[PDB]
Amino acid sequence: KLTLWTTPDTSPNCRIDQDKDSKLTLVLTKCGSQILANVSLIVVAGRYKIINNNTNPALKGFTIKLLFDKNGVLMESSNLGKSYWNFRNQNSIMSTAYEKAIGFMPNLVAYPKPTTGSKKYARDIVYGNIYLGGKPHQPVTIKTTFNQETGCEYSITFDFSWAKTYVNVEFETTSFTFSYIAQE
Amino acid sequence: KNNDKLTLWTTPDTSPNCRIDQDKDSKLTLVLTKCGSQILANVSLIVVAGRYKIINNNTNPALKGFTIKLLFDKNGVLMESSNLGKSYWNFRNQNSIMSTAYEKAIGFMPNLVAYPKPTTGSKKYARDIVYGNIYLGGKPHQPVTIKTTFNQETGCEYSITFDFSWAKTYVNVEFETTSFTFSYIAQE
Amino acid sequence: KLTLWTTPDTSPNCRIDQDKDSKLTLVLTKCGSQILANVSLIVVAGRYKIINNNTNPALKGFTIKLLFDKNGVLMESSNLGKSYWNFRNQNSIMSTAYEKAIGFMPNLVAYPKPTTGSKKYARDIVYGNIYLGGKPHQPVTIKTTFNQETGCEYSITFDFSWAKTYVNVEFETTSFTFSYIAQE
């Protein structure tokens, strides 16, 4: 169907450091040649759950990677658990594994895989801000990069970073919308 | 027939449809376009009259925001108690609306699993918020924050709240804004 | 078709200062009443390829204009080349010029053409930020304005501007998504 998502409940589905330490809520809606993407993050456990830059002054970011094979199937090496990622069915997911989602993959001409000696253009990046706890003075950068991972046919990489000293701040975010050019 | 039941909108005209401070003091231009599981939302605000038409933070140093609330019942019907007026909030027909008031728009409502109503002692997650910026008079040095919150209002089944705020001293600045696009997860 | 675009390749298609000095990657996807727009810019040659505000302290922006006739056909006077602008076919364009794209045009009631004595509202503008070289400390403002150009029925204008002193910074950008209300 036209929506590939994580069920948007708060049940953990993602490993940043350890199994099920986070809930990535990602919704990809196919509008023909463009994927409309909506993303938020809740860290439920482990070193990123509560940021304390007094205790850890160098703790300033982390990465969640979605790696896809040539059929647009999520690879086990992804931070997002494979069992949680599927076409929408009501407020859940299809009960059976999808076989193909190439129509949701980032376009390889728009966003080529990195090669040695190739001119690397920034158009495979989208920057956004999201806010911890919905507080306007707790921005974090969410940088989304398309097809820059090795060992896959396609990738969506979320780099989360911050440039303020956050003390005892739960890492759970507002939402950000972006789009990207679809492979087909 | 030209009924577009994949668009719930305030027509794109500049006819006032909203009360911030007084009846019909503003045009909230809000277009909700259903792209299946996601609503693509486009918003701007024109304050046409009343206290918030012209911001003067010399005269009113504490005036740094205001709120527009859309409250919906269980059928996604806008409640009369909302800031937004009901009469031209409807499914699209060309540059106007469907000839009768809609009875159901649950497909345009913010998803209650994604954006649960608050209950006493409930863990509040921020993912029911989207932040954006719009600019007064289209001037790059006149930013205002538009914070959109889903389903956080009491006495309704769904809600979309727009909190406008600014963090600069605006002196004799007309409150009429650039547009901002966001999306949210649809209830169905 | 539901996508009007520049192919997603890096082949120059746009004149900022001189013919083919830039690749504007612009994808307009019709989602009913709204056009979902995705934009990035690569300057490949001429005065805007490498910004040096030490040498050129007044170089703080430039404009790319798409002018359309009453049928939503791109006019030759546009910065974007006409041969590069068409309905999608896979990763390329239809080989034959489109005759009608009014469904992709910015709504004239939402975004009226300027007239003397008529109140000009800012809602025909969307602001965004993109980043030169994908570097978070190299923001540029991309201001998009609907239907404000003379000598056309519809227009999309991209005003690029910056306030920072950029020294030897290549003008090639991250991507930005916005939407606008469609004429029909």
Author numbering:
A (entry chain A), C (entry chain C): 183 to 366
B (entry chain B): 179 to 366
Show sentences the authors wrote.
We performed X-ray crystallography to generate structures of species D human adenovirus fiber knob proteins HAdV-D15, D24, D29, D30, D32 and D53 in their apo states. HAdV-D53 is of particular interest due to the recent confirmation of EKC causing infection, similar to previously identified sialic acid binding viruses HAdV-D37 and D64. The fiber knob protein of HAdV-D53 was also investigated for its ability to interact with CAR. An accurate IC50 value could not be measured due to a lack of ability to block CAR antibody binding, even at the highest doses tested. Fiber-knob proteins of HAdV-D24, D26 and D32 all had a much weaker IC50 value, with HAdV-D53’s fiber-knob protein seemingly unable to interact with CAR. This again suggested a range of variability, with some viruses such as HAdV-D53 having a clear preference for sialic acid primarily but others demonstrating the ability to interact with both receptors. The species D adenoviruses are notable for their frequent recombination events and when investigated, HAdV-D53 seemed to have arisen from HAdV-D22 recombining with two sialic acid binding, EKC causing adenoviruses: HAdV-D8 and D3728,29. This recombination event, combining two viruses with similar tropisms explains our findings that HAdV-D53 appears to rely heavily on sialic acid as a cell entry receptor.
